[PDB]
């Protein structure tokens, strides 16, 4: 009997509980359940991924087509907070991948630094994502930008980081809480405005979705970055 199967997305597993392979067996990050499966000499541990805490988990359970975060990927994560979702991104990309965890709160930054002591593939970048010139010497070109900064100017922030760091043909995944971007606009008006702005920066959405029943008026937009020469 197989208990934990690979998900459609490489590096994600499904146990309906979503889980990732724990890069640091024995350690939990935010109190999540861990499931360790031993058979003979083999052993693998997974970590439960809470879709009421992690917008990316809610999107995956909501049926997103691609997430682009995969084993070996280099990810620029904007708005890393204390590392809840970053820890699962770190699990997915694995030892040969890389996650830059950009977060400007020093309080949250201390949690990220402690998390990255055990995870070799996390670089805490405790800086303001509006000013990538201050950290551009730390960020090698990346494959994916994941953004969840919950700011009215999030699209401009993401575009500036994309134009600096994202490879041609790389991808983006942007989390959008409508009332964090413009609380006097309707969710549809916010999401349409943000999609429009992305397209103008050669961030072409390939999929957009909302996150019910985990979150209300909260979208995830996934797409590809195809800038001019
Ligand atoms: C919704 S929380 C992120 C939750 C996190 N993505 C997760 O799922 O684990 C938004 C975060 O973005 C951070 N943030 C907001 N504006 C920022 C900026 N200009 N630069 C860096 N971090 C920023 C906030 O401090 C906060 O930690």
Curated annotation (Swiss-Prot):
It is an enzyme of class 2 (transferase). The modification N6-acetyllysine is found at residues 33, 117-118. It catalyses: L-glutaminyl-[histone H2A] + S-adenosyl-L-methionine = N(5)-methyl-L-glutaminyl-[histone H2A] + S-adenosyl-L-homocysteine + H(+); a ribonucleotide in rRNA + S-adenosyl-L-methionine = a 2'-O-methylribonucleotide in rRNA + S-adenosyl-L-homocysteine + H(+); a ribonucleotide in U6 snRNA + S-adenosyl-L-methionine = a 2'-O-methylribonucleotide in U6 snRNA + S-adenosyl-L-homocysteine + H(+). Its main location: nucleus. Its EC number is 2.1.1.-. There is a cross-link at residues 21, 43, 55, 70 (Glycyl lysine isopeptide (Lys-Gly) (interchain with G-Cter in SUMO2)). Belongs to the methyltransferase superfamily. Fibrillarin family. S-adenosyl-L-methionine-dependent methyltransferase that has the ability to methylate both RNAs and proteins. Involved in pre-rRNA processing by catalyzing the site-specific 2'-hydroxyl methylation of ribose moieties in pre-ribosomal RNA. Site specificity is provided by a guide RNA that base pairs with the substrate. Methylation occurs at a characteristic distance from the sequence involved in base pairing with the guide RNA. Probably catalyzes 2'-O-methylation of U6 snRNAs in box C/D RNP complexes. U6 snRNA 2'-O-methylation is required for mRNA splicing fidelity. This is rRNA 2'-O-methyltransferase fibrillarin. It comes from Homo sapiens. The chain holds residues 85 to 317 of 321 of the full protein.
């Amino acid at each position: 009997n197989v208990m934990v199967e690979p998900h459609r997305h490489e590096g994600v597993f499904i146990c309906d509980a979503l889980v990732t392979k724990n890069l640091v067996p024995g350690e939990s990050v935010y109190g999540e359940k861990r499931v360790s499966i031993s058979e003979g000499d083999d052993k693998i541990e997974y970590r439960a991924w809470n879709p009421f805490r992690s917008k990316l988990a809610a999107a995956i359970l909501g049926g997103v087509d691609q997430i682009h975060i995969k084993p070996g990927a280099k990810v620029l994560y904007l708005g890393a907070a204390s590392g809840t979702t970053v820890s699962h991104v770190s699990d997915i990309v694995g030892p040969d991948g890389l996650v830059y965890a950009v977060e400007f709160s020093h309080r949250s930054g201390r949690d990220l630094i402690n998390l990255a002591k055990k995870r070799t593939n996390i670089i805490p970048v405790i800086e303001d994502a509006r000013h990538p010139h201050k950290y551009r010497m730390l960020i090698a070109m990346v494959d994916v930008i994941f953004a969840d900064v919950a700011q009215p100017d999030q699209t401009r922030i993401v575009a500036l980081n994309a134009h600096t760091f994202l490879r041609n043909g790389g991808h983006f995944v942007i989390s959008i809480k409508a009332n964090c971007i413009d609380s006097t606009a309707s969710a549809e008006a916010v999401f349409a405005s943000e999609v429009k702005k992305m397209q103008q920066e050669n961030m072409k959405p390939q999929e957009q979705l909302t996150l019910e029943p985990y979150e209300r008026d909260h979208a995830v937009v996934v797409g590809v970055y195809r800038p001019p020469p």
